[PDB]
């Protein structure tokens, strides 16, 4: 019995929560009350299997049980329609079909949060429903959220209201925390979407490689064999979470933590404090810990991987173990190399070996391999330096605008809201990484960008328009960023001539946050460039100034939406000439 094993292992509290997220990530448009009804029926059921594992149904697989139960509300197409398709299939077709239809951009409201007192009224009135709501809203919006982490944040959500709803000034306590969790939440989600894309679109060999490089950069003292064991374990975990198998993911992550802490001495020295933490924190902590000291003595790379003889012999006998060793050795020495750089280097090594082992002087042709790595190292460093140069002169907001312009010219077929969300997350690199010194700049940035471009890749894949986006995304996971970097203004592109409705704003603009107000200005920008790229000097950064003033002047004009219709029409036309 599976539903039993996982109840015993996770306990009722987590068990209940994971199931909520499973259902919410599979049926996003479906309402809260329904998912809560469903989860409860499964929990009622799981307990019976704990009492008696030979009971009827207990030997069904979790998808079987979870799927049957979802479909008791999903088959109704008049509401969903397409989800009735998976419901027609048996497993494993149906679970494949549910994954197939996870919406990265679901037509869901923006979640408004009421005032602190209302909120705190809801929390003490019934904190169990309040929390269930939190899990519900995030997962349905983030169908690939790493479920074990969603539990760790729910704890932080709960603890905030617990504390802050007794503070003398509740808001000042609460709002910083909620926002930090909103922000920290978004970022986990993106990180986790790149993991699932690796696995689902490129295969586990990719995930391993990324994992091998990554884990090794953190645990350079550890033997390859050990890392391999951590990787195989990490792989299984995220493979499970990416296939919808959330109980088993959560559980396996918990075992991985337990193991990591039992064997600190074989893994790292930065762990001691994480392993004293509570169970939920214990794993998150581990994932966000600084690198261990690099072993004082290490031999040169070249010996084992160039200057040795019978390099092909090892390559032949076990290439995946030979290339993994390279990747391990190279990564543990180079914690300033982004993980994707390490993966291109590792690929450039594989391709060369294929060429050289044919026959003639190998020990010669593959001598200058390390020479072949030099350009790959600098190419991205240049861009970070350069794009950090531009950051401090422009500030975070103006820099985004520049990236918008850059990326909107780059790939102008792309949906506007996409361009904006993306360009802004791209812009966020400056603040995060430029802060640092070069030693930690490259991995910070280039990897952070990897997350943001995979973001673009998925939101695009949904409804593909530009062939250049589809190319850079499908071509090669590791090479996505150089691929976008190298693109240039699209000559093919026929502009859309104009529109009236798009630029004359309404009064509600004044009542929105600077956050959302910048977003309304940044949309405006993106449309203009769509309408007029051919010419695109400062005149872009010029006519932006023309809208921002028009926004704030009419939001302090004291007039009944007058200038928005009258003075808003004078401007929009003027730039078509100007």
Ligand X SMILES: O=C(O)CCC[C@@H]1c2ccccc2C[C@H]1NC(=O)c1cc2cc(F)ccc2[nH]1
CA-to-CA distance for 371 and 563, rounded, in angstroms? 64
How big is the CA angle at 356 (ends 352 and 359), to the nearest 5 degrees? 165
Residue nearest to ligand X (CB): 198
Asked whether 508 and 551 are in contact (CB, 8 A), the reply is no
Q: Candidates 94, 132, 140, 218: give the one binding ligand X (CB under 6 A).
A: 218
Interaction of residue 63 with ligand X, rule CB under 6 A = no
Query: Minimal distance in Å, beta carbon 450 to ligand X?
Result: 8
Looking at the Cβ atoms of 25 and 466, the one nearer to ligand X is 25
CA-nearest of 323, 357, 355, 319 to 342 is 323
Looking at the Cβ atoms of 136 and 207, the one nearer to ligand X is 207
Q: How many CB atoms lie within 10 A of CB 104?
A: 15
Asked whether 148 and 250 are in contact (CB, 8 A), the reply is yes
Residue 180 in marked binding region: no
Residue 125 in marked binding region: no
Looking at the Cβ atoms of 4 and 230, the one nearer to ligand X is 230
Stretch that binds ligand X, among 99-107, 281-289, 308-316, 561-569 (CB under 6 A): 281-289
Q: How many CB atoms lie within 10 A of CB 305?
A: 21
Residue 245 in marked binding region: yes
From residue 103, alpha-carbon distances to 276, 333, 506 in Å are 38, 40, 30
Stretch that binds ligand X, among 210-218, 324-332, 526-534, 541-549 (CB under 6 A): 210-218
Asked whether 235 and 208 are in contact (CB, 8 A), the reply is yes
Stretch that binds ligand X, among 29-37, 179-187, 206-214, 554-562 (CB under 6 A): 206-214
Query: Minimal distance in Å, beta carbon 205 to ligand X?
Result: 10
Residue 240 in marked binding region: yes
Residue 2 in marked binding region: yes
Looking at the Cβ atoms of 73 and 247, the one nearer to ligand X is 247
Radius of gyration of the chain, Cα coordinates, nearest whole angstrom: 26
Query: Minimal distance in Å, beta carbon 50 to ligand X?
Result: 27
Q: Candidates 42, 150, 160, 286: give the one binding ligand X (CB under 6 A).
A: 286
Q: Candidates 80, 210, 305, 349: give the one binding ligand X (CB under 6 A).
A: 210
CA-to-CA distance for 484 and 95, rounded, in angstroms? 34
Interaction of residue 211 with ligand X, rule CB under 6 A = yes
Query: Minimal distance in Å, beta carbon 286 to ligand X?
Result: 5
Query: Around 372, how many Cα atoms within 13 Å sit in the side-chain half-sphere?
Result: 16
Residue window 251-270: x/- pattern of binding to ligand X, with contact defined by CB under 6 A:
--x-----------------
Residue 371 in marked binding region: no
Indicate the DSSP class of residue 392.
H
Looking at the Cβ atoms of 69 and 195, the one nearer to ligand X is 195
Residue 47 in marked binding region: no
Query: Minimal distance in Å, beta carbon 189 to ligand X?
Result: 12
**Which residue's structure tokens are 């975990």?**
237
# residues contacting ligand X (CB under 6 A): 15
Interaction of residue 460 with ligand X, rule CB under 6 A = no
Interaction of residue 287 with ligand X, rule CB under 6 A = yes
Q: Candidates 145, 207, 484, 564: give the one binding ligand X (CB under 6 A).
A: 207
Q: How many CB atoms lie within 10 A of CB 296?
A: 5
Query: Minimal distance in Å, beta carbon 287 to ligand X?
Result: 4
Looking at the Cβ atoms of 285 and 528, the one nearer to ligand X is 285
Interaction of residue 214 with ligand X, rule CB under 6 A = yes
Looking at the Cβ atoms of 282 and 428, the one nearer to ligand X is 282
**Which residue's structure tokens are 């005149």?**
539
Q: How distant is the alpha carbon of residue 571 from its chain centre?
A: 39
Q: Candidates 283, 401, 408, 455: give the one binding ligand X (CB under 6 A).
A: 283
CA-to-CA distance for 96 and 282, rounded, in angstroms? 32
Query: Minimal distance in Å, beta carbon 436 to ligand X?
Result: 18
Asked whether 348 and 478 are in contact (CB, 8 A), the reply is no
Burial class (CB in 10 A: 0-12, 13-18, 19+), 537: exposed
Query: Minimal distance in Å, beta carbon 264 to ligand X?
Result: 12
Query: Minimal distance in Å, beta carbon 197 to ligand X?
Result: 8
Stretch that binds ligand X, among 74-82, 269-277, 279-287, 378-386 (CB under 6 A): 279-287
Token pair recorded at residue 103: 């919406």
From residue 15, alpha-carbon distances to 137, 147, 255 in Å are 18, 11, 16
* Range 143-202, binding ligand X (CB under 6 A): 194-195, 198
Interaction of residue 481 with ligand X, rule CB under 6 A = no
Q: After which residues is the chain broken (C to N over 2.5 A)?
A: none
Asked whether 27 and 35 are in contact (CB, 8 A), the reply is yes
From residue 510, alpha-carbon distances to 178, 504, 516, 556 in Å are 24, 14, 10, 9
Residue 255 in marked binding region: yes
Query: Minimal distance in Å, beta carbon 191 to ligand X?
Result: 7
CA-nearest of 202, 245, 248 to 91 is 245
CA-to-CA distance for 543 and 574, rounded, in angstroms? 10
Interaction of residue 237 with ligand X, rule CB under 6 A = yes
Interaction of residue 391 with ligand X, rule CB under 6 A = no
Contacts of 182 (CB under 8 A, 6+ apart): none
Binding-site residue ranges for Zn(2+): 63, 243, 245
Return residues touching ligand X (CB under 6 A): 194-195, 198, 207, 210-211, 214-215, 218, 234, 237, 253, 283, 286-287
Binding-site residue ranges: 2, 9, 63, 236, 240, 243, 245, 248, 251, 255
Binding-site residue ranges for (4Z,15Z)-bilirubin IXalpha: 236
């Amino acid at each position: 019995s599976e539903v039993a094993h996982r109840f015993k292992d996770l306990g009722e509290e987590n068990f209940k929560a994971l199931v909520l997220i499973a259902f919410a990530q599979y049926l996003q448009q479906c309402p809260f009350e329904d998912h809560v009804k469903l989860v409860n029926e499964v929990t009622e059921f799981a307990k019976t299997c704990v009492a008696d594992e030979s009971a009827e149904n207990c030997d069904k697989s979790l998808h079987t049980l979870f799927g049957d139960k979802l479909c008791t509300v999903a088959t109704l197409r008049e509401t969903y329609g397409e989800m009735a398709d998976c419901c027609a299939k048996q497993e494993p077709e149906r679970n494949e079909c549910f994954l197939q239809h996870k919406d990265d951009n679901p037509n869901l409201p923006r979640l408004v949060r009421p005032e602190v007192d209302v909120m705190c009224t809801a929390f003490h009135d019934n904190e169990e429903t309040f929390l269930k709501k939190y899990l519900y809203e995030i997962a349905r919006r983030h169908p690939y959220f790493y479920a074990p982490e969603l539990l760790f944040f729910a704890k932080r959500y709960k603890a905030a209201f617990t504390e802050c709803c007794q503070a003398a000034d509740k808001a000042a306590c609460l709002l910083p925390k909620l926002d930090e969790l909103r922000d920290e939440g978004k970022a986990s989600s993106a990180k986790q979407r790149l993991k699932c894309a690796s696995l689902q679109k490129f295969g586990e060999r990719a995930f391993k490689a990324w994992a091998v490089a990554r884990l090794s950069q953190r645990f350079p003292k550890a033997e390859f064999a050990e890392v391999s064991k951590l990787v195989t374990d990490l792989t299984k975990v995220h493979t499970e979470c990416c296939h919808g198998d959330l109980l088993e993911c959560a559980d396996d992550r918990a075992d991985l933590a337990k193991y990591i802490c039992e064997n600190q001495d074989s893994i790292s020295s930065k762990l001691k404090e994480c392993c004293e933490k509570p169970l939920l924190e214990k794993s998150h902590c581990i994932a966000e810990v600084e690198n261990d000291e690099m072993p004082a003595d290490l031999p040169s790379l070249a010996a084992d991987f160039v200057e040795s003889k019978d390099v092909c012999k090892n390559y032949a006998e076990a290439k995946d173990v030979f290339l993994g060793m390279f990747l391990y050795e190279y990564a543990r020495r180079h914690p300033d190399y982004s993980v994707v750089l390490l993966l291109r280097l590792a690929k450039t090594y594989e391709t060369t070996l294929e060429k050289c082992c044919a026959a003639a002087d190998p020990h010669e042709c593959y001598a200058k391999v390390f020479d072949e790595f030099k350009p790959l190292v600098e190419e991205p460093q240049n861009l970070i330096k350069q794009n950090c140069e531009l950051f401090e002169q422009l500030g975070e907001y103006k820099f985004q605008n520049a990236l918008l312009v850059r990326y909107t010219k780059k790939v102008p077929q792309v949906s506007t809201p996409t361009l904006v969300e993306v360009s802004r997350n791209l812009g966020k690199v400056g603040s995060k990484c430029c802060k640092h010194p070069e030693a930690k700049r490259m991995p910070c940035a280039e990897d952070y960008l990897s997350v943001v471009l995979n973001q673009l890749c998925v939101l695009h894949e949904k409804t593909p328009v530009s062939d250049r986006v589809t190319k850079c995304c499908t071509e090669s996971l590791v090479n996505r960023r150089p691929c976008f970097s190298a693109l240039e203004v699209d000559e093919t592109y026929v502009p859309k001539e104009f529109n009236a409705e798009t630029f004359t704003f309404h009064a509600d603009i004044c009542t929105l946050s600077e956050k959302e107000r910048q977003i309304k200005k940044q949309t405006a920008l993106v449309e203009l460039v769509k309408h007029k790229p051919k010419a695109t000097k400062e005149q872009l950064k010029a006519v932006m100034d023309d809208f921002a003033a028009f926004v704030e002047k009419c939001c302090k004009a004291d007039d009944k939406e007058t200038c928005f219709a009258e003075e808003g029409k004078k401007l929009v036309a003027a730039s078509q000439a100007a």
